[PDB]
Design a binder for this molecule. Structure first.
Ligand SMILES: C[C@H]1CCC[C@H]([C@@H](O)[C@H]2Cc3cc(O)cc(O)c3C(=O)O2)O1
Ligand SMILES: C[C@H]1CCC[C@H]([C@@H](O)[C@H]2Cc3cc(O)cc(O)c3C(=O)O2)O1
Ligand SMILES: N[C@@H](CCCC[NH3+])C(=O)O
Ligand SMILES: N[C@@H](CCCC[NH3+])C(=O)O
Lengths: 487, 493
């Protein structure tokens, strides 16, 4: 129960009373557990290196007292594990009683060990202590793999999940590898990383409810950024012709399996590129990234959890491209002619939503009626592969340059994995005359377009969602170290 | 004035009605401007690679007097420059009149050029167009090479700064070089980059007023992080023995030349490492970083502004160590007995602050008294070198492990450059029983129960360190204000 904790705290006070520091300041270790394994894994069975005295540290993860002269424990560090073989025969008896100094060690204790390496006669690579010191006690009962199988403990006490579940450390290692590969991918291509503000006086770049904070000495209400689109574009005007940023953005919407209020975004902007270059970049990056982590272009994904059969997702280029409005017309046998904000085709879209009894949008604007229609008729079309939804209308793309041969549409692209959007990119609207919302968006951004924004392609990445599909997770809370929870 | 912008706006429309598109979708370029300079810099004076046709782009920054058969321009891109030599005999007349094409070009316009590389017989590398297309026009008149010193322009319109002032691009490139160097420094030594929340229900890890904001659908009031200290330490408990984060933190206080309400910090945590390990890391990193940027350990810095003689800052290790209480005692010729919140020690700390004509802190705490005495008597001791103020009292360091031989003090260190703090680090307090806030004074203090609970699972002996990335950028780019190293500093409209 909880009496374990109170007894362990009383033990700490008992050691403080006896003149023992249960939290020593420094322990100088000679080697780490992974280095220990690679250095000695090819020892012979039963072999000892009793002349090699090492200092090792780790966390005791299992205790077993066979008889009363041999003590076995599991010592873990950095995700790897070795055994510790405390033999009374090799104990330094001037520095303490053998039995009393090993009876105190509990599961979860951080310890420092002075001893030699070797292998048990069965062949288990072990550390052989002459002396073991408590470094930091685990006062609570450390749970085993049961208990952390599916609770909020993994999300509220992530440290427990990292210690107990081998899967999760590999998961967050993979997330760091993904961001690393992306940063180098762009840097190798001449892109320049920058920091744009997170607090601004308007929130543009996309359209979602923002966070409201107040600056005290400026006496001003500021908005957490919903995207990095606008200031990055101004840098393109500033002559930084290949610029990008990886960081958190904040959208005050609803929490679900693919939405966290703060999430990690990557937006790059690429002068003198168009959406044809953006599609090529998307295909190159995702295929090269998937191969970099798996040595193959095909991966497995448990789309409906580990209790259902998984599907295979081939990342070999090229990916299919599906024009949104044309595909809605093919699936519905409807012809939604322009304008799209017509009451005539707002009526037609509503009747399709009514016929199939799809969710009706909050404000039934054409931009969101088109959204809901694609969400129900295109977005889950391809599951064996990633695919693009391209050539969005202009009333859905206020910042995307108009299509050069298709009136009313933009040169936009979104890439979907298993029906989840992980990418948004388009040829950038750069004619200040045509951004008719300049006379929400900033006036600072509009006047910068008046100084000359070159032809530009821009692309945004949802890093958390890509991590999910590459770590085989169904919820975005499994790829964020401390997801935001309700207390 | 607005007449110039209105003229360009009508010109743009006039081209659209004549059939030309002043904003074409895509122009496929063959080579960049730096690549152009690198590939053709060493040609003879007068060379003409007429058969080698290329597609180059850039921004027109100088329009020379029309010679009626030759037109000269300055083309810039990526902070480098080449000359545009439009010759009438090389013009492709199948696509428009020569004079009418180039008369439209204004300074600031972004153009696409089909031409061949060559050198003027004076030594100037040039591009020789046969066709120039407007890619996107500059509708305002740009300032000139030395007419952008009103810096509420440079801060509010950073794109104009980056175009006109050569030093501005160099300053922000150096900032990225700094952060890249820091990331690879930590990654080379086994450290692991992570991301912690920017929004929490408590704001701990420092002593500062926080930004508060509301999550609408969740109906909760959250606090922006003032530091990454607490969740990173919880990751050490999780067994990530070398962990760090480079990102923004938010502190709702006053703005000056060294304070911006949002600023970039980097905190790392290092299991089984202590104060002594952190001292050498600081010396290794700063000395290696400065040498990496400059090829030397000494730099020049205008601590009194660009109008005054600068000083030399030597980053040659080792740097001096000054223990704050001992030095306050030596400079003021007084001895401050313990405890420090003693009423006689408070009294004599107050009498010193008033014998030396010093501002009295708003809450006359024992810690804030030791704060002000430090800044007036120590923090400007050395100006030619970085140096450490060390061994802070525990009443100023609520998360630093108690000094192992000096009761009342911690194993804490702060590094100062020219009086400004850039580094903060200490041996981590890992005894949950000694964290007095897990079972303070009734404004900018303190704790988190999730953090206290994680401590009860065993935080190993750890050293952690925090770097103020922006202030370090200031000293290495010779800037006096933090606004010179932030691309878009937060400002008042
Ligand atoms: C930057 C963008 C480019 C396209 C791909 C991806 C979006 O689909 C984003 C939308 C979104 C909203 C939200 O409120 C909370 C979220 O976690 C997400 C998300 O993870 O993904 O990132
Ligand atoms: C992470 C810390 C530890 C190392 C030194 C440095 C602090 O001195 C920080 C204090 C601070 C407060 C503030 O409200 C606004 C600011 O821009 C800064 C700042 O730049 O530096 O970074
Ligand atoms: N701001 C976009 C990403 C960039 C799209 C291209 N400008 C988004 O939030 O989806
Ligand atoms: N988080 C602290 C730095 C402590 C360094 C070790 N955690 C700060 O903002 O000053």
């Amino acid at each position: 129960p909880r009496l374990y904790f109170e007894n362990r705290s009383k033990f700490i006070q008992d050691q403080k009373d006896k003149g023992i520091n249960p939290y020593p300041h420094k322990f100088e270790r000679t080697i780490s557990i992974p280095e220990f394994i690679e250095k000695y894994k090819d020892l012979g069975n039963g072999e000892h290196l009793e002349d090699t005295i090492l200092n090792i540290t780790g966390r005791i993860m299992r205790v077993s007292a066979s008889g009363q002269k041999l003590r076995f424990f599991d010592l873990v560090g950095d995700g790897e594990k070795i055994q510790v073989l405390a033999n009374y025969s090799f104990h330094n008896h001037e520095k303490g009683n053998f039995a009393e100094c090993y009876d105190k060690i509990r599961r979860g204790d951080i310890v420092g060990i002075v001893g030699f390496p070797g292998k048990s006669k069965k062949g288990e690579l072990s550390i052989f202590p002459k002396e073991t010191i408590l470094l930091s006690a685990c006062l609570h009962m450390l749970p085993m793999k049961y208990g952390l199988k599916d609770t909020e403990i993994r999300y509220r006490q992530r440290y427990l999940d990292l210690l107990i579940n081998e899967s999760s450390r590999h998961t967050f290692v993979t997330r760091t590898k993904i961001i690393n590969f992306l940063r180098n991918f762009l840097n190798e291509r001449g892109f320049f990383e920058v920091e744009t503000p997170m607090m601004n006086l308007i929130a543009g770049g996309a359209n979602a409810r923002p966070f409201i904070t107040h600056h005290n000495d400026l006496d001003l209400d500021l908005y957490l950024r919903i995207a990095t689109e606008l200031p990055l574009k101004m840098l393109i005007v500033g002559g930084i012709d290949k610029v990008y940023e990886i960081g958190k953005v904040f959208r005050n919407e609803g929490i679900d399996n693919t939405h966290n209020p703060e999430f990690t975004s990557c937006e790059f902007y690429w002068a003198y590129a168009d959406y044809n270059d953006l599609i090529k970049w998307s295909e190159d990056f995702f295929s090269q990234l998937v191969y970099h982590l798996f040595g193959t272009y095909k991966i497995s994904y448990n789309k409906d959890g580990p209790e259902n059969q998984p599907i295979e997702i081939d990342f070999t280029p090229p990916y299919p491209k599906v024009s949104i409005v044309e595909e809605i017309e093919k699936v519905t046998n409807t012809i939604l002619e322009q304008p799209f904000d017509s009451n005539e085709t707002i009526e037609k879209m509503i009747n399709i939503i009514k016929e199939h009894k799809i969710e009706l949008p909050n404000p039934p604007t054409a931009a969101k009626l088109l959204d809901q229609l694609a969400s129900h008729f295109i977005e889950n079309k391809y599951n064996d592969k990633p695919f693009f939804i391209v050539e969005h209308p202009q009333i859905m793309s206020p910042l995307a340059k108009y299509h050069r041969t298709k009136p009313g549409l933009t040169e936009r692209l979104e890439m979907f994995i298993c029906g989840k959007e992980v990418l948004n990119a388009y040829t950038e609207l750069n004619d200040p005359f045509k951004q008719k919302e300049c006379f929400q968006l900033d006036s600072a951004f509009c006047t910068s377009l008046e100084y000359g924004l070159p032809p530009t392609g821009g692309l945004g990445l949802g890093i958390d969602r890509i991590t999910m599909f590459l770590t085989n997770k169904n919820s975005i809370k499994d790829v964020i170290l401390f997801p935001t929870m309700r207390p």
